[PDB]
């Protein structure tokens, strides 16, 4: 996270760290129930860099804060039973449908530091996914593009209008993505960076006071560059697929 600040203890209890069991910090993710983790497909399967991880190569670390520290009597480390990648994840061009579910071997016990995020319903997506509204990104990713934090970082960012997103890049944007970040003349700055991928873009409903995961950190061109925006997977557009695999 660039231009963010330290998270408070327990501020993002759904935050998950993907960790190679060999160790290195692979990506972020989020806890959506006692047995299911949500992340970006590119964290697990990306052929251009020869990345193809299976269930036996990874560990999920939940309830963390400190990036490098094992945090006993707080974090919980779980093994994976099965990984599910969206069938139409397009790693060859776009990163279109950049989403994957991970089923844990055993349910994790919730605590003050471990608790799941909600998934949006159509009405929540309709009222909150608007240009100008801010969501929050969290992660242990790099602090600058070209440098790693000691603790979980947080930044709040505004969703950008679709025409502005489309005109900032040469990549073809789809309806399964949205972009967020400040404009060059907006004064403030901030973004996801290497290592933040797969983590959650969340918003707090003013209707029922619950936190909702609207996006998944998917890709960017550099980090915190003027005129460039962070691109996120649109969780609500892929919600039927999620519900189907979970069943």
């Amino acid at each position: 996270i660039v231009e963010g600040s330290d998270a408070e203890i327990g501020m993002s209890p759904w935050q998950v760290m993907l960790f190679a069991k060999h160790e290195r910090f692979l990506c972020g993710a989020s806890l959506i129930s006692d047995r299911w983790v949500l992340t970006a497909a590119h964290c697990l399967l990306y052929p251009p860099w020869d990345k193809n991880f299976t269930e036996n190569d990874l560990l999920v670390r939940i309830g963390k804060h400190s990036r490098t520290r094992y945090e006993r009597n707080i974090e919980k480390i779980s093994m994976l039973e099965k990984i599910y990648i969206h069938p139409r994840y397009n790693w060859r061009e776009n990163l279109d449908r950049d989403i994957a579910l991970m089923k844990l071997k055993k349910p994790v016990a919730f605590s003050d530091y471990i608790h799941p995020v909600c998934l949006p319903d159509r009405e929540t997506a309709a009222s909150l996914l608007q240009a100008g509204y801010k969501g929050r990104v969290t992660g242990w990713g790099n602090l600058k593009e070209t440098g790693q934090p000691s603790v979980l970082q947080v930044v709040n960012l505004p969703i950008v209008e679709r025409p502005v997103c489309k005109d900032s890049t040469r990549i073809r944007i789809t309806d399964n993505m949205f972009c967020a970040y400040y404009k060059p003349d907006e004064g403030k700055r901030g973004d996801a960076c290497e290592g933040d991928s797969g983590g959650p873009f969340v918003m707090k409903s003013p209707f029922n006071n619950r936190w909702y995961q609207m996006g998944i950190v998917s890709w960017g061109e550099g980090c915190d560059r003027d005129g460039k925006y962070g691109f996120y997977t649109h969780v609500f557009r892929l919600k039927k697929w999620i519900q189907k695999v979970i069943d």
Binding site: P13, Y113, N209
Partner: peptide, 27 residues
């Protein structure tokens, strides 16, 4: 479930340091 209600914040009616910045952007 009891999703999106944090044990150390919403459940105790305590606010984190910057959540008001989000709520103020919602109109």
């Amino acid at each position: 479930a009891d999703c999106g209600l944090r044990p150390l914040f919403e459940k105790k009616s305590l606010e984190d340091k910057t959540e008001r910045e989000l709520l103020e952007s919602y109109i």
